[PDB]
Ligand binder design. Structure first.
Ligand code: ADP
Ligand code: ADP
Ligand code: SF4
Ligand code: SF4
Ligand code: MG
Ligand code: MG
Lengths: 272, 272
């Protein structure tokens, strides 16, 4: 068995930083993990690979002729802790559907045997500003059974979490895609942890961890590293270890209860 | 003649707040303006209408039968300063293309005669996290000749500005869609104004105005108002008046020069 997990959330909220640091902490424990980048920015693996980014399946297929000319060894790259990394890519802006590379990539990985048995986790890092096209495909086609949403006390971040939750509800009659929890990426505002706990309870899920805002993240990423690799003794490294522990231990996977705009506004007013 | 302007930028950056306040300041000057909401959040007009949001063309068409059963007077609503307001809407998350309502709405407005002659400006408030589908249609189909991008010193916000710029370049052989400028919505960080000026110069455009972070915006929006209406004497009201003046006076409309990831990173390191 392997646990197939997808990280969703609005752009800029911290998906790729949180995912790569979470995954580094899992590899540090001895878990075997693969990260599949599903965001057109295509930098979801650079901290594991110590890289600028990673060349995408869309790009490589175009240079080789067809996706079928590609081999798994050409596409999958191993970084920190042996974590395996791949990027979907997407069409250039204004051309096509921005999510179409996600469909190509996941299908390639499945057929080429990337989901080999002693993998323990696969994480998809998915753009969540719209839930359509290839960005909905991990939910629609039952690829990621456990959805974790990165958010913060930002109204736009909570709206994105609600929108993703609506997509999960839409496909609950098929497959087994469920909401696993919210991850608060702190804006260093007062009572933010309480706000995201309250939101999670209204959705029917939990706040699985509160990630502090810590400048060590920037210092690590400037050097193309996770905090786990850059400074294993940092306070923030222990935070990502705590998140990883709670993700491994999590048993609550629900069909969420999306909330109305009135409830969101009441949350923000209530917690000041 | 009327100037057709589109506001693009990443989610949560300040598009709807800046657009509605800019438009209120224009109406305060005596300009006749229409706002067309092109973001599925569909709250791009609530500060002009003093409303929770506005019912969308997609929703209203579904309740009436077809879009053709709708009349312009049913769909367009007038608020502060006589500003006319409409929302496109979009399909529910996980269903369809999130931008498909934009195509329906703009086509309806054109055929129903909404672009009547003593309008001075039309502003489209467009989701910019992906540039595809209906969100690309104002650029692809030559609907908004002047693109203004809201950004900030956030790396994700500058990446979005670059991505939007790539979409403008892609369609420069047809129509006349051009980049008009960047609008910095401040995160209250040091040297942010200089950073966005530098980015604009690299793209070939200008920073048309630096909008300060001001809590009066929250106090006004809690009361469903622009700052222009809520407190016409506020410092921040004069900021939006300055932006409006510079938008009216702007003559620089360019095919931009998108930059590489290396140049973006160098900008951020340079300005600390
Ligand atoms: N906990 C944190 N503390 C400090 N900076 C953070 C934290 N999480 C993310 N960041 C920074 O936020 C920015 C955006 O994060 P990223 O993971 O790229 O967002 P996304 O993938 O959701 O677009 C990056 O500069 C990252 O370094
Ligand atoms: N200049 C500003 N100062 C303070 N708060 C702001 C400012 N601009 C925007 N905001 C707040 O930022 C949040 C997001 O802005 P909004 O215009 O809804 O973003 P978008 O439409 O780009 O998603 C809103 O809560 C708004 O009140
Ligand atoms: S939103 Fe992108 S193509 Fe449908
Ligand atoms: S990205 Fe939304 S449907 Fe193509
Ligand atoms: Mg990312
Ligand atoms: Mg908006």
């Amino acid at each position: 068995a392997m646990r197939q997990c997808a990280i969703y959330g609005k752009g800029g909220i911290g998906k790729s930083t949180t995912t790569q640091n979470l995954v580094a902490a899992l590899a540090e424990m001895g878990k075997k993990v693969m990260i599949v980048g599903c965001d057109p920015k295509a930098d979801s693996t650079r901290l594991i690979l110590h890289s600028k980014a990673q060349n995408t399946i869309m790009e490589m297929a175009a240079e080789a002729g067809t996706v079928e000319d590609l081999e798994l060894e050409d596409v999958l790259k191993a970084g920190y802790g042996g974590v395996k990394c791949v990027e979907s890519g997407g069409p250039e802006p204004g051309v096509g559907c921005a999510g179409r590379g996600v469909i190509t990539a996941i299908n390639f990985l499945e057929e080429e045997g990337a989901y080999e048995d002693d993998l323990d986790f696969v994480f998809y890092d998915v753009l969540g500003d719209v839930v359509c096209g290839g960005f909905a495909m991990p939910i629609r086609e039952n690829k990621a059974q456990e959805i974790y949403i990165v958010c913060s006390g930002e109204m736009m971040a909570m709206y994105a979490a609600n929108n993703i939750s609506k997509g999960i509800v839409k496909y609950a009659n098929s497959g087994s895609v469920r909401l696993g929890g919210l991850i608060c990426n702190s804006r260093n505002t007062d009572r933010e942890d309480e706000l995201i706990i309250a939101l999670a309870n209204k959705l029917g899920t939990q706040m699985i961890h509160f990630v502090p805002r810590d400048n060590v993240v920037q210092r690590a990423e400037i050097r193309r590293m996770t905090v786990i690799e850059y400074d294993p003794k940092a306070k923030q490294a222990d935070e990502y270890r705590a998140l990883a522990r709670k993700v491994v231990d999590n048993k609550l996977l629900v069909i969420p209860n999306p909330i109305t705009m009135d409830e969101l506004e009441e949350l923000l007013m209530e917690f000041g």
